[PDB]
Swiss-Prot record, chain A:
Keywords for the protein's UniProt record, in alphabetical order: Decarboxylase, Lyase, Pyrimidine biosynthesis
Disulfide bonds: none
Enzyme class: lyase
GO MF terms held by the record: orotidine-5'-phosphate decarboxylase activity
Entry's EC annotation: 4.1.1.23
Active site, renumbered: 59 (proton donor)
Protein's name in the database: Orotidine 5'-phosphate decarboxylase
Organism lineage: Archaea, Methanobacteriati, Methanobacteriota, Thermococci, Thermococcales
Length: 207, 206
């Protein structure tokens, strides 16, 4: 299953692309830049126009009440899932889960992640096991991490994996290693033919 | 110096309150809920209506490029400072600092902060010392934390302190202990007369 990181900051174009690839994706993921540029209502427009589930990749990291206010507005606009950090505490995570389904951050992909976040991943996975969110993200860059997380994560909690390599076999291998969803961005939205690009990835996964 | 936590989510009401208290505050701090309700342009409007600097309390905690995209848009809308987390790493902090002034989160005061954030406060202060942001936030629930952080924080970096008690002399003590700015919320924006409330706090601090 593919999660399209719809990082097309032109509202009308983003909606057109999402509608065109709907047949081959399971969810659309939106971020703060898109919400800032098009208004939070871009989420409702997308929900009404495509009927595809929406993940709001906000990586919420505020105090409980503020996380709650943000979640109320975003789930309110049509989001089905909100990505939240684990680092700020269980109360901040539960303030969001109270209003809708969540996906927790237990490990990150950038160089800075090695400073504080990744050394704590084992502990963050234990928190996710306690909370039982819909899922967690496993930087799919290098495979090993998908399996590493899967081996420590309670069954029932899904894994979404971004950063999959372009080599043939990489997407199917990520799923075989533990990824329930593959998060894809530019490979689809900036393709000459987004629908055919999504179909190609979908076909490898189901092949 | 007072930083108004303008946690009024109807933008025009936020503007009305901000305008009424502008002459007693140093900065206006806005958060995601206000930005989501009125649009990011509310930052430009608050600045135009009050002539006061704006802090965007976003607590950014994303990868460098996403932090950068958000910062570009928010500073572009008129923010003078952006609040960012330290825990996501130096590169994510610098991605924002390259576009405008930043304030770093090194400690929090909700119960959940005891799990992972607060045990790392000393280390986060050291990261702030190397980065040299405009300031850091020093939770004032426990007033002694202001002095604790000030002593360990590089000279030149400012401290903004929220959570100071309403008891007389407390805000003044916090300033004298090392807080350059006192962050005030409900005591001003939910007051019967926000302007008089702001003046009252301003006079107690001075």
């Amino acid at each position: 299953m593919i999660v399209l990181a719809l990082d097309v900051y032109e509202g009308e174009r983003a909606i057109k692309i999402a509608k065109s690839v709907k047949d081959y994706i399971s969810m659309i993921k939106v971020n703060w830049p898109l919400i800032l540029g098009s208004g939070v209502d871009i989420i409702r427009r997308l929900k009404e126009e495509t009927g595809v589930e929406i993940i709001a990749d906000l990586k919420l990291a505020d105090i409980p009440n503020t996380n709650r206010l943000i979640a109320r507005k975003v789930f309110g606009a049509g989001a089905d899932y909100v990505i939240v950090h684990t680092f700020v505490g269980r109360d901040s995570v539960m303030a969001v889960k109270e209003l809708g389904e969540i996906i927790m951050v237990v490990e990150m992909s950038h160089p800075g992640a090695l400073e504080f976040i990744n050394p704590l991943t084992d502990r963050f996975i234990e928190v996710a096991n306690e909370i039982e969110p819909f899922g967690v993200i496993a930087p799919g860059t290098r495979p090993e991490r998908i399996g590493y997380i899967r081996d420590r994560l309670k069954e029932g909690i899904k894994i979404l994996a971004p950063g999959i390599g372009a080599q043939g076999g990489k997407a199917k291998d990520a799923v075989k290693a533990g990824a329930d969803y593959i998060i894809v961005g530019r490979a689809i939205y900036n393709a000459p033919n987004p629908r055919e690009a999504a179909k190609a990835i979908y076909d490898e996964i189901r092949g």
